[PDB]
Structures are given as structure tokens and as C-alpha cells.
């Protein structure tokens, strides 16, 4: 059924699974018109489809041309997401297809179920976890590829860089969600923490800096402090 | 006018005939029901006084044979049987009528209720939903499951309604997922009407039969089917105008006849609220909306 803290270790077992987050599919800026009305302007978006065991990220870039002349875009965006996830599954060899797809927002359940009727053995599940995947566009290299796109595109990434050489996928996912939660809560301070030290760089083929094990502990502590600091500012604690 | 005689009434029972009902005492001199209007299907139904478990009954049409009821003390119920000897049957009925041992079907002349509830219901179509080919009448009870209920268990004793499932490959064309899920017109008009039912009369017949089995037997599966067939129409953007006007009339008379005290167990709040206030046809069912709002405003 739903995925929560009780069955959290299930994310790191050997059954292939994908998280699908649609938050950044339909993105707009809101502005006044010359006549003083309000209008939206869409900007490029993305589907965030992640294997939490391996770190494989299938980033489908959603180019603004897909909205041209369409109505009810917030609704269409859910169905476009489901169409694209279904297309990805069909493109994968049988032995790489997921056994479960976990949607971060319950409004994706029916669109994905309907698009996946041909795969009755793939379970479509919601989650009770609040996952910060909306903050993926705070990762500079992901935001860059999305904004530069001139046509629909799929780009593949490993969102854990090389961490799985040293840590388990449970720990890697915990690190990722902490980083993304910090970027969601205070992006500027989070990026300051990650880049403050010029001697630690991001390899051409990576998304995050090349921290040693001890430095990752420092970084993780600084991210937890950021989150707690912002909680205190928010609630006057 | 036709007659269904009873051999006897050895157990106390509430007997229904269509929308009417009356109580018979244990071993009372009751020998059946006369003056049954020719031209419609009918249902004769039972609820035992000493055990309200299992409502059960029989759908029949007096034009198809001479039918009577006899209690079976082994199986513990009133059974319908056909009498093939016509002169024997007429002689039995005449004797019981002469001794005034029959109740008269209590139809008011102004009253079109039964016609309005069975307009599209035909015995031949009943016998395909309820499969027991050696009898001309059809047994239904409170516990019988539907074919769809069984897929989700004795198949011989099942209600073979047409399966409706909005998240099924039958309902959704590959490549038209959003279109077909948000607008059920394909599934209604091409799959169901043109493909399975052949015409709207057969579809309305099954819808009306499902409602009546839900109401008279408390059949849960019958209730799910009746709601499903309403929702499929209401959730379609493209419905022939004649079907929408007929549906409004069908539902109006169903809601009018429903016992007020069973409204909680016969009307589903999610399905009615959707059909009346959110669906494509939210403004096409004026008579049904008006009776629903005046009779069951709580459900809404
Ligand atoms: O569950 C209910 O609240 C309810 C209330 C009155 C009738 C029914 N009949 C079965 C039914 C019909 C439609 C959808 N689900 C179930 C259900």
C-alpha cells in the first residue's frame, strides 16, 4: 500500500523500485500584463525519477513547447508525467523494469495507474514520507541542463556521485534527503556550506563536492544546524 | 389478469409482490396472489418472520407459464414451480378464488409506479443475468454475488451483470489514457452501448433490474452495479439527449420509491454528489436532482 517509516528499509532491498516526483514538471512565473491583469509564463521543467538503491536518476526534461495550446495545464502535467514514466518503463529491458513505482504526491496515483494498466504486476504506491525532491532544481548541474534545453530530452545522472563505494544506499539516501531538505529550507546558506571551502571541488562527472568521510560528517552537521536554525527563525523558538 | 397460487403457507413470512408487501401468519389459510397485471415482469419475494436472514424471491412473467409457490420443508423456503397441466392449474386457482383465499395485487388505477420501474426490464434479459436455464423464472437472494465481485464463489449461483471497471484496459484506449479516464464517452458509447448492450434499452433494463434487486433483497453487488451504470453515463461528456432524458425519469421513480429508512444503505453519497454536482451531466438530471434535494438533503 503506502510507503512510510515502518517499511523504510524496503527502499534498499533488491526489488527494483523508482520514486517519481512531479513537483517540477509544470513551472511558471506570474506577472502583470500591460492592461494590469495577471498572466503566467511557463519555464522548462523536469520529471524526477529516482532509483533509491542505485542512485540512478532519469531526469526527463519537460520543454515549454509541450504546453503550447493546451488547457488545464496543472491537470495535464500529471498525465504527461505518467505518460513519460510509462514510456521509460517500456524502454527498459524486462529485467530492469521496476516492481514498484512510489509517487511523492497522491494526485499522481490514478494517472500513473491508468498509464500502466499493461503492467498489472508493477505496484503503484503513495508514500507518507515528505521527501524534498522539489529541491532538485537547486542542484546547479540539474538546473543548468533543464534551463538550457531547447527540446524534450532525457538526461541520466547518478545522484549519489561515487558515495556507494564507501557507504550503504540507506546512508546515501539519508545524506541526499538531508542535503535536499537543507537546500529547500535555505538554498543560499546550503550552497554556502557546500562550496565555502575552495579546496574541495565538484568533479566534472559529479553533482556534489568530493568530500572525505570526515568532511561529510562536518557537512551533515552543518546542514542539520541550518535546518534547526531555520525552524527557530520560522516559529520564533 | 394472472394468478400465482400457493399450495399453503406453513411458516410465518412477509411476502412481497413488486413494491407491495403483506404479512402471512404461520399456517394461515393463504393461497396466493390474484389480479397480477399482464404486460410486465414481476417479482415475488420473501422474508421469514423467524429468520430475517436471506431475503429471497423470484422474477417471473405470467405470459411465459403457469407458476405457483410451494414451501419445501427440507430446503426451508418457498419455491416457485411451473405447472404444465393447464386445466389442473385453472381448476386449482378457481377453487381458491371462490373461497377468497387469495390477496389481490393492490394496484391503484392512476398508479404507473411499477411500469416506471420496469419499463426496460425483460424476462429474457433477466434469464441471462441469472443463469438457470431449466426454469422460466429466476431466483435471486440477498447474498448472491456478482461476476465482478467474484473476480475480486460458486459461479452457478452468481449475478452475471455486465462488468464495469473504470481502470481497466476495456475502459481505456492505449494512447487515449487521459481523454478516456476523464471522459467516459468511448467506454459508454462504443464499448458498452454499441458493443455489449447493442442499444440503450438493454442498458437501462440492466440498470433497472440492478436497482430492484438492491432494493428488494438488499443485494450489495446489485447496488454496486446500479451506481456503476449511473456513474458511467454521468461521467460521459457525449450522451444522446434521449438517453439523458430517459435516465432522469428512471432515476426519479427509483428515488421516489426507495424506502426513506433504507436511504442510508441504498444511496452512496460519493457517487450521487459526483453525478449531481460535479459530472458532465450535473445539469441534465433536473427531476432527479429536485427529488434528491427534497427527500435526501442529508446525503448531499
Ligand atoms: O458504502 C456506502 O456508503 C453505501 C451506501 C449505500 C449503498 C451502497 N451500496 C453499495 C455501493 C454502491 C456504490 C459504491 N460503493 C458501494 C453503499
Curated annotation (Swiss-Prot), chain A:
Changing residue 21 to N: Reduced growth at 30 degrees Celsius. Strongly reduced growth at 16 degrees Celsius. Residues 7-237 are annotated as: RNase H homology domain. It is found in: Nucleus. Coiled coil: none annotated. Changing residue 22 to A: Reduced growth at 30 degrees Celsius. Strongly reduced growth at 16 degrees Celsius. Strongly reduced growth at 35 degrees Celsius. The MPN (JAB/Mov34) domain has structural similarity with deubiquitinating enzymes, but lacks the residues that would bind the catalytic metal ion. Functions as a scaffold that mediates the ordered assembly of spliceosomal proteins and snRNAs. Required for association of BRR2 with the spliceosomal U5 snRNP, and the subsequent assembly of the U4/U6-U5 tri-snRNP complex. Functions as a scaffold that positions spliceosomal U2, U5 and U6 snRNAs at splice sites on pre-mRNA substrates, so that splicing can occur. Interacts with both the 5' and the 3' splice site, as well as the branch region. Has a role in branch site-3' splice site selection. Associates with the branch site-3' splice 3'-exon region. Also has a role in cell cycle. Present with 468 molecules/cell in log phase SD medium. Component of the U4/U6-U5 tri-snRNP complex composed of the U4, U6 and U5 snRNAs and at least PRP3, PRP4, PRP6, PRP8, PRP18, PRP31, PRP38, SNU13, SNU23, SNU66, SNU114, SPP381, SMB1, SMD1, SMD2, SMD3, SMX2, SMX3, LSM2, LSM3, LSM4, LSM5, LSM6, LSM7, LSM8, BRR2 and DIB1. This is Pre-mRNA-splicing factor 8. The lineage of its organism: Eukaryota, Fungi, Dikarya, Ascomycota, Saccharomycotina. The gene is PRP8. The chain holds residues 1836 to 2069 of 2413 of the full protein.
From Swiss-Prot, chain B:
Residues 244-265 are annotated as: Leucine-zipper. The gene is AAR2. Present with 7330 molecules/cell in log phase SD medium. Component of the U5 snRNP complex that is required for spliceosome assembly and for pre-mRNA splicing. Involved in splicing pre-mRNA of the A1 cistron and other genes that are important for cell growth. InterPro entries: AAR2, AAR2_C, AAR2_C_sf, Aar2_N, AAR2_N_sf. One of its GO terms (biological process) is spliceosomal snRNP assembly. The modification Phosphothreonine is found at residue 257. This is A1 cistron-splicing factor AAR2. The lineage of its organism: Eukaryota, Fungi, Dikarya, Ascomycota, Saccharomycotina. Heterodimer. Interacts with PRP8 (via RNase H homology domain and MPN domain), competing with BRR2 for the same binding site. Component of a U5 snRNP complex that contains at least the U5 snRNA, PRP8, SNU114, AAR2, SMB1, SMD1, SMD2, SMD3, SME1, SMX2 and SMX3, but is not a component of the U4/U6-U5 tri-snRNP complex. It comes from the Eukaryota. The keyword Nucleus applies. One of its GO terms (cellular component) is U5 snRNP. Transmembrane segments: none annotated. Belongs to the AAR2 family.
Amino acid at each position: 500500500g503506502a510507503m512510510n517509516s515502518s517499511n523504510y528499509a524496503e527502499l534498499f532491498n533488491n526489488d527494483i523500485k523508482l520514486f517519481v516526483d512531479d513537483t517540477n514538471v509544470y513551472r511558471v512565473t506570474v506577472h502583470k500584463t500591460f492592461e494590469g491583469n495577471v498572466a503566467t509564463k511557463a519555464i522548462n521543467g523536469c520529471i524526477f525519477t529516482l532509483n533509491p538503491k542505485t542512485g540512478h536518476l532519469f531526469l526527463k526534461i519537460i520543454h515549454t513547447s509541450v504546453w503550447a495550446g493546451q488547457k488545464r495545464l496543472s491537470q495535464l502535467a500529471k498525465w504527461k508525467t505518467a505518460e513519460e514514466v510509462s514510456a521509460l518503463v517500456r524502454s527498459l529491458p524486462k529485467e530492469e523494469q521496476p516492481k514498484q513505482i512510489i509517487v511523492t504526491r497522491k494526485a499522481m496515483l490514478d494517472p500513473l495507474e491508468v498509464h500502466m494498466l499493461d503492467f498489472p504486476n508493477i505496484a503503484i504506491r503513495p508514500t507518507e514520507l515528505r521527501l524534498p525532491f522539489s529541491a532538485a532544481m537547486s542542484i546547479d548541474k540539474l538546473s543548468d541542463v533543464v534551463m538550457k534545453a531547447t527540446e524534450p530530452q532525457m538526461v541520466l545522472f547518478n545522484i549519489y556521485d561515487d558515495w556507494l563505494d564507501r557507504i550503504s544506499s540507506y546512508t546515501a539516501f539519508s545524506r541526499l534527503t538531508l542535503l535536499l531538505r537543507a537546500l529547500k529550507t535555505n538554498e543560499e546558506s546550503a550552497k554556502m556550506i557546500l562550496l565555502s571551502d575552495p579546496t574541495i571541488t565538484i568533479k566534472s562527472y559529479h553533482l556534489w563536492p568530493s568530500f572525505t568521510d570526515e568532511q561529510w560528517i562536518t557537512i551533515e552537521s552543518q546542514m542539520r544546524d541550518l535546518i534547526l536554525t531555520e525552524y527557530g527563525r520560522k516559529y520564533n523558538v | 389478469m394472472n394468478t400465482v397460487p400457493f399450495t399453503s403457507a406453513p411458516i410465518e413470512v412477509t411476502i412481497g409482490i413488486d413494491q407491495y408487501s403483506f404479512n402471512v401468519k404461520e399456517n394461515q389459510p393463504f393461497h396466493g396472489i390474484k389480479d397480477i397485471p399482464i404486460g410486465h415482469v414481476h417479482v415475488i419475494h420473501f422474508q421469514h418472520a423467524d429468520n430475517s436472514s436471506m431475503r429471497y424471491g423470484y422474477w417471473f412473467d405470467c405470459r411465459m407459464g403457469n407458476f405457483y409457490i410451494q414451501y419445501d420443508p427440507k430446503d426451508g423456503l418457498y419455491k416457485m414451480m411451473e405447472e404444465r397441466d393447464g386445466a389442473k392449474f385453472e381448476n386449482i386457482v378457481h377453487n381458491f378464488k371462490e373461497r377468497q383465499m387469495m390477496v389481490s395485487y393492490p394496484k391503484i388505477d392512476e398508479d404507473d409506479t411499477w411500469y416506471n420501474l420496469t419499463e426496460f426490464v425483460q424476462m429474457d434479459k433477466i434469464r441471462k443475468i441469472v443463469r438457470k436455464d431449466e426454469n422460466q423464472f429466476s431466483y435471486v437472494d440477498s447474498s448472491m454475488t456478482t461476476v465482478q465481485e467474484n473476480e475480486l464463489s460458486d459461479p452457478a449461483h452468481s449475478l452475471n451483470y455486465t462488468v464495469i471497471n473504470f481502470k481497466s484496459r476495456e475502459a481505456i484506449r492505449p494512447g487515449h489514457e487521459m481523454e478516456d479516464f476523464l471522459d467516459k464517452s468511448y467506454y459508454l458509447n462504443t464499448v458498452m452501448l454499441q458493443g455489449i448492450f447493442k442499444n440503450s434499452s438493454n442498458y437501462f433494463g440492466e440498470l433497472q433490474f440492478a436497482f430492484l434487486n438492491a432494493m428488494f433483497f438488499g443485494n450489495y453487488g446489485s447496488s454496486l452495479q446500479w451506481h456503476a451504470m449511473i456513474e458511467l453515463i454521468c461521467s460521459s461528456a457525449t450522451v444522446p439527449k434521449h438517453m439523458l432524458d430517459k435516465l432522469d425519469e428512471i432515476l426519479y421513480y427509483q428515488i421516489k420509491t426507495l424506502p426513506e429508512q433504507y436511504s442510508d444503505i441504498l444511496l452512496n453519497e460519493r457517487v450521487w454528489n459526483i453525478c449531481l454536482y460535479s459530472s458532465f451531466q450535473k445539469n441534465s438530471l433536473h427531476n432527479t436532482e429536485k427529488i434528491m434535494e427534497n427527500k435526501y438533503p442529508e446525503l448531499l
